[PDB]
């Protein structure tokens, strides 16, 4: 039997970022030449992943954030990966991108990769927390693959 | 059998960097809701996570720092996953944060994810290398979980 | 009965970006004490990783850039990884460095984790995708570890 596990991004609908407002992620499909889901026993529920099977999972993200400083300057972002609801974020899963010194263009971030027990039903989500000007989110990807099963109980 | 793994983290209390010192890793349960421990045959020995069981393991970091150019400026570090001792580092493992690139306020980095043999007994930990400033960590975590038995 | 993995590093031979040359990795053993291939059904070709197994991969890589020497004003960055031909690049997969300053030493950069499903033979490798002056690579790192076997 195969691990649960999904992958769902954002690499041709641009967003603006709006507090705690889950960002989009419209595609499941990351190979170009094979294009096929690549979600096992997760479901995408259009701005983030359902999880069906309790286990330990590792999950992690990426913006693209387009910095002009315009209309306004600065242009900053916090982000967090959030658990069923969007202020319940967890630790160790922050990003942060400003336009004071990088100056002008597309910039990427990328988060650490989180373990953490999950049950079914439990909603995986990219969040912004703070954000000063207007934030241009030109891509975002969401992670989700199971490490392993519950290691202190039988089905959770 | 289970993968072996471990997640230590520090979410709750600043420290500030210093050469070739272990970062301080209290906590062991990220879940907010469900809070349990995340670690399976390895051990969070409070500034890092020993392998109890040798195996291929993928591991990877991340930090938050706090720039604001005062009590000295610029404020830079760089960080690396250091194997038994704080010398032995690890390659692809580093992170780095200058404040004369990236400017003042609060930045997050992440390291890439390395694919390494572990033996038992072997301590991961975070060390910085490199610290120009007073180096305000405000979050750390360390990511350890085994993908593979011995291969040879 | 093993998961498929790659791990292909450069810590030693500094290269400079060129657009959609893949950055070169001529090393397969991060470990420095017991030093070992961590490859197991999968090939290190010295630009990349070929896959020689069909299945759900983990792909991700790391970058250090040097703005040492490189004289140029501004300096800019942007990588991703490649599937088969370097202008086939993989959604997901995006790293920048933008230095309005040098001097400043070494900066990393480090992507996301791609789940994907790949073929027999697919070579994935980093690509610059734009450059502004100078790059410096000091280092790079490619990560490939299979996640399942194919699941449709
Ligand atoms: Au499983
Ligand atoms: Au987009
Ligand atoms: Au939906
Ligand atoms: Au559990
Ligand atoms: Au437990
Ligand atoms: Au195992
Ligand atoms: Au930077
Ligand atoms: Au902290
Ligand atoms: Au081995
Ligand atoms: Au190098
Ligand atoms: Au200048
Ligand atoms: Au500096
Ligand atoms: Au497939
Ligand atoms: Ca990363
Ligand atoms: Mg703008
Ligand atoms: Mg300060």
């Known amino acids: 039997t195969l691990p649960a596990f999904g992958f769902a991004f954002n690499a041709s609908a641009p967003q603006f970022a709006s507090l705690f407002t889950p960002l989009l992620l419209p595609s499941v499909s990351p190979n ?11 479901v995408s529920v259009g701005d983030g992943i359902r999880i069906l099977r309790a286990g330990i999972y590792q999950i992690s993200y990426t913006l693209t954030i387009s910095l002009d400083n315009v209309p306004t300057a600065p242009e900053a972002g916090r982000f967090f990966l959030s658990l069923n609801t969007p202020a319940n974020i967890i630790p160790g899963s922050g990003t942060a991108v400003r336009s004071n010194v990088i100056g002008t263009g597309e910039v990427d971030v990328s988060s650490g990769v989180i373990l953490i027990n999950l049950n079914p039903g439990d909603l995986i989500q990219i969040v912004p927390v703070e954000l000063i000007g207007t934030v241009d989110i030109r891509a975002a990807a969401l992670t989700v693959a199971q490490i392993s099963r519950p290691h202190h109980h039988h089905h959770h």
């Open 32 to 42: 170009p030449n094979i294009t096929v889901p690549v979600i096992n026993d997760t």
